[PDB]
Amino acid sequence: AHFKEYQVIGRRLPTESVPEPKLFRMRIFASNEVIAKSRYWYFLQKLHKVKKASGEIVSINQINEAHPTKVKNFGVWVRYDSRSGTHNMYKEIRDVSRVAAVETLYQDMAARHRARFRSIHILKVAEIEKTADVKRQYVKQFLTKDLKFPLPHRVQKSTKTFSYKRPSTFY
Amino acid sequence: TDSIVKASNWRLVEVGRVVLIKKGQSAGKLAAIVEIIDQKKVLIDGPKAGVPRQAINLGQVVLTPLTFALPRGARTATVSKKWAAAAVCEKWAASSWAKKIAQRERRAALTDFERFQVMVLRKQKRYTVKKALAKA
Amino acid sequence: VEPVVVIDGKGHLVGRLASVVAKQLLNGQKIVVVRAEELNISGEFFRNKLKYHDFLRKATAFNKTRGPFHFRAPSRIFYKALRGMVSHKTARGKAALERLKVFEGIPPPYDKKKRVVVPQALRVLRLKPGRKYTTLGKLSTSVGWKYEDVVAKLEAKRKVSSAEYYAKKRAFTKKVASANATAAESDVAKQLAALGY
Amino acid sequence: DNTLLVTGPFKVNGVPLRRVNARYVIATSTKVSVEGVNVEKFNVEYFAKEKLTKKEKKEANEIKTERVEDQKVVDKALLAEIKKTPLLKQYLSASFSLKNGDKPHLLKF
Amino acid sequence: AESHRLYVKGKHLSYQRSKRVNNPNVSLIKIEGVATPQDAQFYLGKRIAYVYRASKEVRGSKIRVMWGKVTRTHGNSGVVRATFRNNLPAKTFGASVRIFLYPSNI
RNA sequence: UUUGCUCCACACAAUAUAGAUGGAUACGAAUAAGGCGUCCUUGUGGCGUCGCUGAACCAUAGCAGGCUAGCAACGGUGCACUUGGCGGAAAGGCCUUGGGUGCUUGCUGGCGAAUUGCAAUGUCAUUUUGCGUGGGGAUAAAUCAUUUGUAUACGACUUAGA
RNA sequence: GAACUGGCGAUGCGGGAUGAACCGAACGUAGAGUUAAGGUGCCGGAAUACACGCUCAUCAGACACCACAAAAGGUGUUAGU
């Protein structure tokens, strides 16, 4: 859906042999708290020997964007499962916030590789603080000095089923 | 002789371009394009008309012929200051586009007595114009 | 809203226009479609010629006379595409289809009337620039229509007469606009401007 | 009985003193002041039909004098208020009708 | 004047139906001018008359009326649902019909 | 074939309506281009303006739209004529000259309206036919039967016969 | 030819165009409202909705059961290592 980012902090259940476990923390892009906690336990079952019955979640907090009106370039490292194997990819997206960047990332992977939400693993997402570290041409195209371009062929959708003059596509 | 081309210019999208929000929650106010995200969407701000600073798809706005000076990525205080300095609100209001919008909403706001009044006045004006249509 | 709606078929897409027009007839609007030779079909001319040859193969084996009839005129091609979208085998479908007449060119009942377009079926508004399209008159005369040039000659004559009409209309409207501008800025003009007219 | 007392005035458009249903009118924004008219005389018993027997059948085929000078009393007080703002007499004399392109959900009355 | 119309024109489109089963008790009406349910909400509760003619004079007239009312909106495009005292005869699919302005809220 | 047939006008009946209820309101071409106005050296020309929908334009007041009076203009519109054209794709329509006549809400007045009783389509459209008037217009063929054989199972076809 | 369960047989209804078994849901006679599975260009009730991409096929493709296609290739095009 429209994604939100949460921090989820959890731990193992405390025993007498070891009280105070190590309080692992992860950042999850998810639609809501339930999906966020499910993905948290999914990745902790991939990492450490723990499961939901043997552990607990001590905190979940929404992390909204610090500057939601700054235009950033993000580099995203992704695992995905194809029909024959597992691959790593690095894609970079020029967008205004992290949740919108990963939303366009999920759309981009589903469009160009037919990869689903169950197949995509988000390794990391990070803002590229400096230009000329941008490595893709499709985003390096929009970083030029005095960028301007026209929008040819305007199509205006009509409300009536009949129009009384030939329309114009000037913009 | 000299070489002749048809130039065919139209309404470039860049910083400082004034746009009119077509649909949405604003839906009819003016904004200024602050920066360009990608081919299909831009970051705009409309601080005099009360449009919050936001990223928006280019299909939800209409570009106007108005342009003024901004550096890219300008914050809303600078956007409002340059908007007031270039004074593009009455420059928009002087256009026939805004006059058409104002005419449409005035005709929508007329009542039945005012519709009777414009019918009487239109009959009087039609009488004098068709009287003028007999000498030329 | 109108008694009869006259649609200029030039530059329109066949299927999208037919799906607009069939719903208009089923709702009860009378439609006449003129200039059927200038419809457009998306795709290559060779693709649509191959499509028509695949349609032309189909006939009843034991008697070709009772088989599917392959009509060759552009108007009858449009009629086929529209009869596909009207449930023509019922009385409601027949009553709908008798509210339609489709013509090549603009006949003398309709050359003095007003032609409209359907903007959601126009080729310049629907297709991406770069996609290839066909002309229905060219495809139809490739598959056997005999009257492509006589329609062109009649259309040239009609366009000459219509330009002669339009010159007089433009001169008259410039006189009327001049008189309206000179009779503006009076008291009734300012009161009408305050009231929105 | 939840009805509205209305008048034309009868000199303007020929509508007499009458009562109508509130669900069968449109309240326009045009307002005149009716202070100075003594309408407390009229009530539900003022309009009586004098119901007809079943024997009296009209095979093929009048007005109260009290009603006609009551109308003449009230309408001369209304038209004095009508003469202040222009074109109200013409507006009340003209009829209302829907033209082509009139959308009543968008029209303001 | 030359116009005396105090109603809104509409078209009787069809019955309420699924893909293969129709229901004659609820008719579907296209009111002209309205293209959204929010504008169609103005017309709820208004009376509808289907006015037709017959050869045989019944009580002084050769014109017969079928009365009904608007009940709810239908779809996203301003079609409304209408119920009548006797259902519409289904040969009137595409026939004109009158939506009156009473009972008015304005 | 006992006064029949067609057209025109209204008079009354019948007959129905795939569905009037202000107006189908006429360039062509392009869409990575145009429209309109203006100017010139008339062009793939210069300059200005417009679009961002018909949410337009025209029409629109009067007993379902009456009866009258005046002012101002010499306009606008309807009807029956009338002069001249143009239109063959399915022309059956478009334009125009002249006079008549009616209305005019361009402006200002006078009289009428009720009782359909608090709504009831509250009836005003066009399609076909018949029968009457009274006014024009014109006075045929086909088939069976007979015959032919360029035809033919029979029908049909091709011929002939005051 | 066996094991566990659910069905059809014995069962109509909405969807899968069509079908014993699939999906949804099981049934007195009616009214109103809301939905399931499935859909909303037209047939056909319902957005020619919104948003991001991809594809142009001189046999495109279009939805589980289900009404088929493989190995091997292609400076076609897109995204990656």
* Domain spanning C148-197, CATH class: mainly alpha
Q: CA–CA separation, E80 vs B45, rounded Å? A: 40
* DSSP-assigned beta bridge partners for residue D3: D21
Q: In what order do the strands lie in the sheet with B51-57?
A: B51-57, B41-46, B30-36, B17-21, B61-67
Whether B121 sits inside 8 A of C179 (CB atoms) is no
Whether B10 sits inside 8 A of A95 (CB atoms) is no
CB-based contact A9:A25 (threshold 8 Å): yes
- Distance between alpha carbon C119 and the CA centroid of its chain, in Å? 12
By what technique were these coordinates determined?
cryo-EM
Q: CA–CA separation, A126 vs B7, rounded Å? A: 44
| Pair A63, A75 in one domain | no
Two tokens at D75? Answer: 């309408």
**Whose C1' is closest to the CA of A158: which nucleotide?**
F53
CB atoms within 10 A of CB A136: 14
Hey, is C93 helix, strand or coil? helix
Listing DSSP states for C58-88 in one string gives ---SS-GGGS-----SHHHHHHHHHHTTTTT
Q: Mind telling me how many Å the CA of D94 is from chain B's nearest CA? A: 9
User: Which amino acid is present at B100?
Assistant: K
| Pair A93, A48 in one domain | no
Distance C65 CA to F149 C1' (A): 35
Q: Does A142 touch chain B (CB under 8 A)?
A: yes
Number of domain units in chain A: 2
Is C23 (CB) below 7 Å from strand G?
Answer: yes
- B53: nearest CB among A69, A147, A151: A69
Asked whether residue A78 is assigned to any structural domain, the reply reads yes
∠ CA C12-C13-C17 to the nearest 5 degrees? 85
Identify the CA nearest to E28 among candidates E42, E55, E48.
E48
Strands B61-67 and B17-21: antiparallel
| Pair A141, A76 in one domain | yes
Q: Which nucleotides of F are covered by protein (CB under 7 A)?
A: 14-34, 36-38, 44-46, 49-65, 73-76, 87-94, 105-107, 111-115, 117-125
Hey, is B65 helix, strand or coil? strand
Identify the CA nearest to A151 among candidates C121, B16, B38.
B38
| CA-based torsion, A152, A157, A158, A164: positive or negative | positive
Specify the DSSP element, H or E, that contains A141: none
Whether C117 sits inside 8 A of A161 (CB atoms) is no
CB-based contact E50:E91 (threshold 8 Å): no
Q: CA–CA separation, D78 vs C33, rounded Å? A: 58
User: Which amino acid is present at A96?
Assistant: V
- E11: nearest CB among C27, C92, C96: C27
CB atoms within 10 A of CB A123: 11
Q: Which domain range does residue A136 map to?
A: 69-145
CB atoms within 10 A of CB B115: 20
Distance B93 CA to G8 C1' (A): 75
Is B71 (CB) below 7 Å from strand G?
Answer: no
Q: CA–CA separation, B80 vs B48, rounded Å? A: 6
Q: Which residue has the tokens 């009508």?
A: D82
Chain E residues lying within 8 Å of C27, measured CB to CB:
11, 13, 30, 94
CB-based contact A58:A26 (threshold 8 Å): no
Whether A71 sits inside 8 A of B37 (CB atoms) is yes
Q: CA–CA separation, A6 vs A1, rounded Å? A: 15
| Pair A57, A38 in one domain | yes
Q: Which nucleotides of G are covered by protein (CB under 7 A)?
A: 13-16, 31-33, 41-54, 56-58, 60, 78-81
* DSSP-assigned beta bridge partners for residue E72: E81
Residues 63-92 of D with CB under 7 A from strand F: 63-64, 67-68, 71, 90
Q: Which residues of A139-164 are buried (b: 16+ CB within 10 A; e: fewer)?
A: beebeeeeeeeeeeeeeeeeeebbbe
Residue C1 to residues C27, C29, C31, E56: CA-CA distances in angstroms? 12, 9, 12, 31
| Pair A58, A10 in one domain | yes
Q: Is the preceding peptide bond at D9 cis, omega within 30 degrees of 0?
A: yes
Q: Mind telling me how many Å the CA of D21 is from chain B's nearest CA? A: 21
Strands (E) located in A65-128: 72-81, 86-95, 120-127
Q: Does E58 touch chain D (CB under 8 A)?
A: no
Is A7 (CB) below 7 Å from strand G?
Answer: no
* DSSP-assigned beta bridge partners for residue B21: B61
| Pair A63, A76 in one domain | no
CB-based contact C151:C64 (threshold 8 Å): no
Identify the CA nearest to B36 among candidates B44, B45, B47, B24.
B44
Task: Return all residues near C10 (Cβ < 8 A) that are at least 6 apart.
Answer: C35, C38, C39
Task: Return all residues near A144 (Cβ < 8 A) that are at least 6 apart.
Answer: none
Please report, for the domain that includes residue A35, its CATH number. Answer: 3.10.20.10
User: Domain extents for chain C?
Assistant: 1-147, 148-197
Give the largest Cα separation in chain E, rounded.
48
Give partners of B (≥3 CB pairs < 8 A): A, C, D
- E34: nearest CB among D25, D98, D105: D105
Two tokens at C66? Answer: 């009772």
Write down the CATH superfamily of domain C1-147.
Ribosomal protein L13 (3.90.1180.10)
Is E15 (CB) below 7 Å from strand F?
Answer: no
Task: Return all residues near C21 (Cβ < 8 A) that are at least 6 apart.
Answer: C7, C31, C33, C82, C100
Distance E45 CA to F121 C1' (A): 19
Q: CA–CA separation, A95 vs B41, rounded Å? A: 9
Q: CA–CA separation, B101 vs C49, rounded Å? A: 49
**Whose C1' is closest to the CA of E11: which nucleotide?**
F19
Q: Which residue has the tokens 């007080």?
A: D77
Q: What is the DSSP letter of A14?
A: P
Q: CA–CA separation, A142 vs A148, rounded Å? A: 9
| Pair A136, A109 in one domain | yes
Task: Return all residues near B101 (Cβ < 8 A) that are at least 6 apart.
Answer: B28
CB-based contact E11:E97 (threshold 8 Å): yes
* DSSP-assigned beta bridge partners for residue E52: E64
| Pair A74, A60 in one domain | no
Identify the CA nearest to A149 among candidates B58, E12, B111, E68.
B58
- C26: nearest CB among E94, E95, E96: E94
CB atoms within 10 A of CB C78: 24
Which CATH architecture describes the domain B12-94?
Answer: Roll (2.30)
Give partners of E (≥3 CB pairs < 8 A): C, D
Phi, psi of E15 (to 5 degrees): -85, 165
Is E85 (CB) below 7 Å from strand G?
Answer: no
Phi, psi of B62 (to 5 degrees): -120, 130
Domains of chain E by range and CATH?
1-106 (2.40.10.190)
3-state SS record for chain D: CCEEEECCCHHHHCCCCEEEEHHHCCCCCCCCCCCCCCHHHCCCCCCCCCCCCCCCCCCCCCCCHHHHHHHHHHHHHHHHHHCCCCCHHHHHHCCCCCCCCCCCCCCCC
